[PDB]
Amino acid sequence: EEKEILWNEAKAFIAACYQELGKAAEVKDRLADIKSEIDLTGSYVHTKEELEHGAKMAWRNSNRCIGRLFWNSLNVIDRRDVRTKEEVRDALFHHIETATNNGKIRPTITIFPPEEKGEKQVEIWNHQLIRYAGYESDGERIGDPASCSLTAACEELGWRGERTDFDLLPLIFRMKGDEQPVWYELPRSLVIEVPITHPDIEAFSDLELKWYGVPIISDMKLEVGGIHYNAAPFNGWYMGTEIGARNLADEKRYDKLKKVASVIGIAADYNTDLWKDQALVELNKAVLHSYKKQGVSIVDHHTAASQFKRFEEQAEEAGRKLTGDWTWLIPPISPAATHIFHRSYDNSIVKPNYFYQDKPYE
Amino acid sequence: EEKEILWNEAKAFIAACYQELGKAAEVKDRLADIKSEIDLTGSYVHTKEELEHGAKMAWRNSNRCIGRLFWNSLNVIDRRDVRTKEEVRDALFHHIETATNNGKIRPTITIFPPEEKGEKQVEIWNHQLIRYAGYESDGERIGDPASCSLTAACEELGWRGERTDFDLLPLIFRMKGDEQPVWYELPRSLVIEVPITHPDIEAFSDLELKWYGVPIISDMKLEVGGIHYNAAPFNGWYMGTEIGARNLADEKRYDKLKKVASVIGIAADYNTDLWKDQALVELNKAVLHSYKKQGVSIVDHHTAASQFKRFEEQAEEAGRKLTGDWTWLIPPISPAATHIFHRSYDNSIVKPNYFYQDKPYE
Ligand code: HEM
Numbered sequence: 001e002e003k004e005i006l007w008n009e010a011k012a013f014i015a016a017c018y019q020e021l022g023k024a025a026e027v028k029d030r031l032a033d034i035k036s037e038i039d040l041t042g043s044y045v046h047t048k049e050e051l052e053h054g055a056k057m058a059w060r061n062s063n064r065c066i067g068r069l070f071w072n073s074l075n076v077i078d079r080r081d082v083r084t085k086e087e088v089r090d091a092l093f094h095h096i097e098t099a100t101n102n103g104k105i106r107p108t109i110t111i112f113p114p115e116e117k118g119e120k121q122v123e124i125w126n127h128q129l130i131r132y133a134g135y136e137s138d139g140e141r142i143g144d145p146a147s148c149s150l151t152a153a154c155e156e157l158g159w160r161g162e163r164t165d166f167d168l169l170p171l172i173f174r175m176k177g178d179e180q181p182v183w184y185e186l187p188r189s190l191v192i193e194v195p196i197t198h199p200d201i202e203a204f205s206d207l208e209l210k211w212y213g214v215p216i217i218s219d220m221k222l223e224v225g226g227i228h229y230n231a232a233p234f235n236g237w238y239m240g241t242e243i244g245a246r247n248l249a250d251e252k253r254y255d256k257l258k259k260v261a262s263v264i265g266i267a268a269d270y271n272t273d274l275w276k277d278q279a280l281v282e283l284n285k286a287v288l289h290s291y292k293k294q295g296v297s298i299v300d301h302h303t304a305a306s307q308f309k310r311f312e313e314q315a316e317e318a319g320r321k322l323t324g325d326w327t328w329l330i331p332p333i334s335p336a337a338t339h340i341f342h343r344s345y346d347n348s349i350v351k352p353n354y355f356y357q358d359k360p361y362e
Numbered sequence: 363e364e365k366e367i368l369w370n371e372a373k374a375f376i377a378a379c380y381q382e383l384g385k386a387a388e389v390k391d392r393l394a395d396i397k398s399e400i401d402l403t404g405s406y407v408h409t410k411e412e413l414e415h416g417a418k419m420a421w422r423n424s425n426r427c428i429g430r431l432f433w434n435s436l437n438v439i440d441r442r443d444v445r446t447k448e449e450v451r452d453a454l455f456h457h458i459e460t461a462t463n464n465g466k467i468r469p470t471i472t473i474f475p476p477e478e479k480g481e482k483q484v485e486i487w488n489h490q491l492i493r494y495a496g497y498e499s500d501g502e503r504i505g506d507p508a509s510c511s512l513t514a515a516c517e518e519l520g521w522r523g524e525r526t527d528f529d530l531l532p533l534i535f536r537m538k539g540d541e542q543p544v545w546y547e548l549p550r551s552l553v554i555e556v557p558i559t560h561p562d563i564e565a566f567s568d569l570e571l572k573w574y575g576v577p578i579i580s581d582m583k584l585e586v587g588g589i590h591y592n593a594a595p596f597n598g599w600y601m602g603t604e605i606g607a608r609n610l611a612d613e614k615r616y617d618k619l620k621k622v623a624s625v626i627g628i629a630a631d632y633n634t635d636l637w638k639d640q641a642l643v644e645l646n647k648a649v650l651h652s653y654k655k656q657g658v659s660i661v662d663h664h665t666a667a668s669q670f671k672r673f674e675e676q677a678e679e680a681g682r683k684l685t686g687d688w689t690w691l692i693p694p695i696s697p698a699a700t701h702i703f704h705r706s707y708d709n710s711i712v713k714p715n716y717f718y719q720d721k722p723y724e
């Protein structure tokens with residue numbers, strides 16, 4: 001029965017993949033071999049070329065991503081050979097180092113063995129490989145609230161955070177056959193962080209804000225031709241509003257706008273003064289400035305939207321339908337200053353793609 | 363056949379209306395009379411109470427409107443008695459005066475006779491009763507581009523604009539039986555305008571920007587219980603971002619951000635400087651400041667979203683489903699600083715409601 005779903009997804013994927021790669025003649029024979037492999041084994045294994053192109057197609061089809069112009073230059077690392085937790089840890093360390101690339105961030109994905117019978121071989125608990133811990137106990141709030149439940153689960157496993165506002169969570173993942181995940185502290189030499197300063201306002205450093213250099217999303221499932229790679233962490237570089245308009249600004253995140261207003265010298269007393277807006281713009285200028293000054297890749301939302309316009313143009317020229325999720329593509333500051341705001345997008349789901357999956361804690 | 367649609371919409375509307383008004387006992391008899399009136403005449407006439415409550419329900423059900431907390435205090439003017447173009451003009455003048463209310467804007471709707479056999483009795487051509495003209499001819503762009511086609515149609519009818527950037531369009535409407543609409547210049551004594559100045563930056567007045575005090579949308583159809591009031595202009599007060607983030611900022615509108623940047627003393631050369639964002643915030647501060655200084659009602663988007671949160675709470679308490687269009691409810695600056703951004707809304711269409719209708723020019 002699932003052989004049916006699998007074979008169907010296989011046909012659809014191999015045909016499209018090989019057509020894009022100029023390999024249309026090889027489809028019939030490759031499909032023959034896949035049909036046999038499924039019958040005999042219940043599954044099939046992707047060639048290196050298929051897996052690479054599949055992961056790139058999945059980024060290309062990610063409706064919520066403004067950064068897709070660069071889909072074809074994704075660096076794909078095939079780690080389907082891993083079997084041990086040391087190998088997994090070392091692969092994850094390696095991904096941090098190679099994606100970071102001394103600041104000149106390389107979009108990269110590391111792909112681990114896929115689910116077999118719906119059974120995961122490796123289950124990554126982190127939301128991102130680099131993320132700060134969060135704590136809330138009797139009135140006291142420290143760190144990133146979005147990390148509270150994962151932080152608590154880590155401290156059930158014997159990890160203990162220093163309870164600064166920026167503790168790095170350890171890597172945490174579980175291997176097939178193990179009842180419990182294992183965790184490993186990140187080597188600080190691998191993790192670039194950027195202090196936030198402002199180009200003109202010297203007091204801005206008084207806020208003692210910082211953020212990490214590379215967002216490496218590690219909790220999504222990559223699905224390609226019916227094969228489910230539940231562990232396949234990937235990264236790009238940040239768009240500054242993710243940090244300045246959301247991570248540092250949201251009330252349920254670091255909630256810094258009132259402190260930003262004070263250091264930039266404006267009152268935070270009257271809605272009509274638009275002090276939240278002014279604070280957001282200055283915080284976002286600081287974030288871009290800081291990353292650039294330190295030589296860590298970042299894109300501003302205007303440049304990102306201009307790149308996305310080229311992605312829409314390239315889709316049309318290639319004769320591919322564009323899909324998109326307008327509610328995620330607009331940036332959270334000045335969205336109507338981008339072309340995205342002024343058009344609509346078909347939010348159809350096309351595979352290969354990246355998918356949410358249930359948390360293993362919570 | 364349309365008697366079917368009409369009678370059905372009638373039943374649904376009268377039942378809900380009378381239930382909200384405490385008049386549930388009177389429904390059966392009122393429906394009896396409506397059934398007879400439809401049979402004999404092809405239509406039915408709303409009581410003053412029904413029409414008033416229907417227009418209020420239509421605002422309440424307007425998914426794209428952030429300003430609905432105040433739905434029940436809509437001032438409804440019943441002008442179903444008008445038969446002549448002088449009466450229509452005078453009603454429209456009266457609406458401007460009474461809605462404006464010397465700056466303390468009263469949300470108001472004036473309701474004209476409804477469509478009979480799908481035949482309009484009065485057809486209003488204006489998008490808003492007060493709006494600026496726009497011109498584009500051989501390279502030359504003047505005024506509001508969104509008004510170009512209506513401006514051209516007016517100049518086909520013998521009107522001539524002064525070709526300032528802020529010419530007031532005349533009222534223009536057509537009566538049943540007339541082949542052509544008529545137009546009337548607005549008396550300038552009726553039209554409040556606000557010069558845009560900034561609270562701290564004195565050079566801002568050099569841009570010589572202004573805007574009109576009251577948005578009076580005059581091209582939508584109000585539908586209540588199956589009766590179609592295609593001419594029923596209504597107004598609220600502005601939310602400052604409509605003026606500062608869209609009318610004065612959009613590239614296809616007045617396109618002022620580059621000029622704003624220059625007068626506030628910042629470079630407009632690098633996307634990473636976020637100069638468009640900074641210019642937007644200062645333009646929006648100026649707009650709020652200017653309206654307030656002149657005593658003309660306006661709301662900022664933070665206060666408006668806080669009022670909308672109370673509207674959602676009141677809907678729940680009343681046991682009414684909330685409907686909303688997230689893409690229109692978020693403001694165009696700092697949307698993630700509002701609660702609206704962080705939730706979702708059911709965009710179902712519920713009647714009574716306001717609806718688009720085809721332009722009679724174009
Ligand atoms: C190269 C730089 C990149 C930039 C600047 C970028 C930008 C973004 C942004 C701003 C978001 C919205 C995030 C949020 O609001 O929470 C996003 C979503 C997304 N991006 Fe990209 N992206 C990049 C690369 C990548 C890569 C390499 C992949 C995968 C190979 C990817 C897949 C996605 C996906 C799946 C989402 C949606 C996540 C969800 O539904 O929660 N992006 N991207």
Ligand code: HEM
Pocket residue numbers: 417420421424426427428429430432436469470471596597598599600601604661666690716
């Ligand atoms: C009292 C102050 C009011 C405020 C501050 C307000 C605010 C707004 C805003 C900001 C929009 C979005 C406009 C755009 O993006 O083009 C809007 C849409 C709307 N408002 Fe309100 N509004 C108010 C009163 C009213 C009244 C009195 C009515 C009708 C009785 C109304 C009906 C609507 C409708 C129908 C739309 C959607 C128009 C469309 O689909 O194009 N509003 N409102």
Ligand SMILES: NCc1cccc(OCc2ccc3ccc(N)nc3c2)c1
Pocket residue numbers: 067215217219220235236237238239242355356357
């Ligand atoms: N549980 C899945 C889940 C929940 C929330 C966010 C998310 O990913 C957001 C995301 C994904 C990929 C990105 C790539 C680059 C970038 N700058 N931001 C990015 C942000 C994934």
Ligand SMILES: NCc1cccc(OCc2ccc3ccc(N)nc3c2)c1
Pocket residue numbers: 429577579581582597598599600601604717718719
């Ligand atoms: N052709 C229908 C059409 C097209 C575009 C906009 C519109 O109305 C926008 C609108 C409607 C009512 C409003 C009431 C108050 C306000 N501040 N803005 C408001 C804005 C109506």
Ligand SMILES: C[C@H](O)[C@H](O)[C@H]1CNc2nc(N)[nH]c(=O)c2N1
Pocket residue numbers: 326341342343344689690691692
């Ligand atoms: C078609 C596209 O979604 C369009 O730009 C919408 C989006 N959101 C909006 N929101 C508001 N309040 N007003 C608008 O005119 C628009 N335009």
Ligand SMILES: C[C@H](O)[C@H](O)[C@H]1CNc2nc(N)[nH]c(=O)c2N1
Pocket residue numbers: 327328329330688703704705706
């Ligand atoms: C559910 C609700 O639409 C939610 O706030 C979405 C809206 N738009 C977004 N857009 C982006 N880029 N990122 C987000 O996290 C969200 N949140």
Ligand SMILES: [Cl-]
Pocket residue numbers: 215242247
């Ligand atoms: Cl993030």
Ligand SMILES: [Cl-]
Pocket residue numbers: 577604609
């Ligand atoms: Cl307007």
